[PDB]
Design a binder for this molecule. Structure first.
Ligand SMILES: Nc1ccn([C@H]2C[C@H](O)[C@@H](COP(=O)(O)O)O2)c(=O)n1
Ligand SMILES: Nc1ccn([C@H]2C[C@H](O)[C@@H](COP(=O)(O)O)O2)c(=O)n1
Lengths: 316, 316
């Protein structure tokens, strides 16, 4: 079945992975260097052995395609994937007047009544961002995030390059170019960056009338991170090919540090006992073309029957 | 034997590769997405089925490590790997007064007496660069080349970042970092770059006391390019590990567009009839540590017995 490569990656780390202490401090099992490919002509690589929220995947993707970096857009789409980063700056800043929302990321998970306090302050910040234009502009803009990297790279001479935009035109005029690259790694920002991009860089390739994309991910959370990632980039591969009028080829996922957090072992072993179901089908609005103008109703995921979801603690 | 992966890549392209027209215009057979690893603890991955000039590999590598971008250094090391690029600017410029060295890259290979004229003008330029300080500074500096990318990345606010330098310190203090990346791809230079970097970006990894490096190469000439590349980066992996006091792990080569030029088919098939010999051994000067201060006598390649060299036309 289409998702097998992922299952084999999980098995692999679990069997051949060596223990490696980590940044967050909850040790991992890791392998360095891995590559797996999915033939997008067979279906959409959205995991069926575990429920994955596609809606969160696309709203976040459209956010990137708009070159948007403001959390407000996601919020009106009920996506809260990036709230924490915005909250971080806000809480550790002048205006924040309230409880000790310091180190909230761990203390919340721990157990205290603090969870309510945190979740409340967050709920608060979230409403401000969504209605207070000055606040949104001040605390909701994350700045250097995938949207600005892909669509507004900062030139040395104070300007803006739309990488992804330029790359799409290239695929249209010079489909056989070996230079169709989009990079998110900027040497000058990473030294003091919150979380340097995990999806470091990707490359397009055209031949036989099919489009393929290869992503280089410096670091990956096999359990929590990879599933979303495979889908997000498989979606991109479809969108661009829809714009360029090409057929979809494969999606190739190359890893640097592929890893499984020790406290995800039971959960991953739960997944491994399940057997894949037929891959779901994706269909884009046949009318619309300029993917930048794409809207959520323009993307559909036909018949997806996944096993229930599996819960597991986040590590940051 | 250690070099088998390369042989399997060549077989693979030759058997499974699809034809793809190319930039230079001498069609290729290509595959998209490939990864191969070499266990550096077994020997040095310098091809034995075909003679590869190691001396050219290291003089070019030391040139990179010095953050040097001037052709003069290589010339005093009898390395002429980058002369063409320097000649290009020089010939198509004010001062050049002489024959029609225009489009020299093809006309030279073709057959005319021109080869002598070209080779003479080149021989001329080469002597100027090596002795005329004003000329060297004007026409010998290539500018944006691996040396400046690795060791003097240009900040937006007009400054210089020594990526590789910083990364080595990181490996020394935070060996388990998943952010040990060195990128050569700058979105603002590639639009109007002669030849955007093929060795796009690499990543370091440490665990078990061994250092590993993974290189992402957007485009590769299996026949002429890959052999050198594998060695150059295997050398780097040894040097850095010598500085950091780590044991050597593997070298992982990830490709984007792995390709074989149609006019290299016979030659590659020559190689494929040979059987690998034991991998050579590399040993660095045990005294010296700051690799930046490394000199050629500080690197040695013990017992390398390759089959003769194979000749093949260059395509640019
Ligand atoms: N889109 C993302 C973002 C993060 N991570 C993971 C990678 C690491 O597990 C951790 C980030 O830590 P580090 O900077 O050390 O890689 O989160 C991931 O798998 N996918
Ligand atoms: N160090 C290098 C430099 C170049 N090439 C090859 C890659 C392509 O075959 C051609 C450059 O063309 P392009 O820009 O289209 O990739 O030269 C290579 O294999 N290794």
């Amino acid at each position: 079945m289409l998702e097998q490569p992922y299952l084999d990656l999980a098995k692999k780390v679990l069997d051949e992975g060596h223990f490696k202490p980590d940044r967050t401090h909850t040790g991992t099992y890791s392998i360095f260097g891995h590559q797996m490919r999915f033939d997008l002509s067979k279906g959409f690589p959205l995991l069926t052995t575990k429920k994955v929220p596609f809606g969160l995947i696309k709203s976040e993707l459209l956010w990137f395609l708009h070159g948007d970096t403001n959390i407000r857009f996601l919020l009106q789409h009920r996506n809260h994937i990036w709230d924490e980063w915005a909250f971080e700056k806000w809480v550790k800043s002048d205006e924040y007047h309230g409880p000790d929302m310091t180190d909230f990321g761990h203390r919340s998970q721990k157990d205290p009544e603090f969870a309510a306090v945190y979740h409340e302050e967050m709920a608060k910040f979230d409403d401000r961002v969504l209605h207070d234009d000055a606040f949104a502009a001040k605390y909701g803009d994350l700045g250097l995030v995938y949207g600005s990297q892909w669509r507004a790279w900062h030139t040395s001479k104070g300007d803006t390059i739309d990488q992804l935009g330029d790359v799409i035109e290239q695929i249209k005029t010079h489909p056989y170019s070996r230079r169709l690259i989009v990079s998110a790694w900027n040497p000058e920002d990473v030294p003091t960056m919150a979380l340097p991009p995990c999806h470091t860089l990707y490359q397009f390739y055209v031949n036989d009338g099919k489009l393929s994309l290869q992503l280089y991910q410096r670091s990956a959370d096999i359990f929590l991170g990879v599933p979303f990632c495979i889908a997000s980039y498989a979606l991109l591969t479809h969108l661009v090919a829809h714009e360029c009028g090409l057929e979809v080829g494969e999606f190739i996922h190359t890893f640097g540090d592929a890893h499984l957090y020790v406290n995800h072992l039971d959960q991953i072993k739960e997944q491994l006992s399940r057997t894949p179901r037929p891959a779901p089908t994706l269909q884009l609005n046949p009318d619309k073309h300029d993917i930048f103008d794409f809207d959520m109703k323009d993307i559909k995921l036909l018949n997806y029957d996944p096993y229930p979801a599996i819960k597991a603690p986040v590590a940051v």
